[PDB]
Write a protein that binds this ligand. Structure first.
Ligand SMILES: [Cl-]
Ligand SMILES: [Cl-]
Ligand SMILES: [Cl-]
Ligand SMILES: [Cl-]
Lengths: 91, 87
């Protein structure tokens, strides 16, 4: 069982070597898994879903850690943006 | 185990358009409400202008919802995933 509401991140990826290119799925898959590993080693457990060729969702086991994860991701070269969202309605 | 559904939405009156956020927001709310009136509680996370995640913390209810959603005119696709953290 979890403590707290469910939060996730959306994480955009840009390859600076090809900056206007959105169809970079291999690169997004590579780097999101690396970031997941680095976050795991900082004691932040999350599940990754690659939902576009250049965008992924990180779902947290503990939503309290969403800000630590956003802060980490925004330090990474290939992260273009990061937003945090909770549930859309009231269910 | 918590289960979730990835739900794709299509507006047949705006065929081949993904920029249908108002329609997606309306219909995901309606489906959530209809399921709640039959005792299935879920949370919606809208993830694109035509896609949402429905999360079922009573996990088994996800298969009931999947059956309900796949027969909706405005649902293009529904896939089911389990919540799982490496460890
Ligand atoms: Cl590391
Ligand atoms: Cl994962
Ligand atoms: Cl944000
Ligand atoms: Cl909700």
């Amino acid at each position: 069982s979890k403590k707290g509401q469910t939060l996730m991140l959306f994480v955009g990826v840009v390859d600076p070597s090809q900056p206007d290119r959105s169809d970079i799925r291999p690169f997004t898959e590579k780097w999101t898994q690396i970031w997941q590993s680095q976050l795991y080693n900082n004691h932040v457990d999350l599940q990754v879903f690659v939902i576009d060729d250049n965008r992924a969702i990180f779902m947290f086991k503990n939503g309290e850690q969403a800000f630590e994860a956003k802060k980490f991701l925004l330090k990474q070269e290939f992260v273009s943006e990061v937003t945090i969202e909770g549930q859309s309605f009231d269910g």
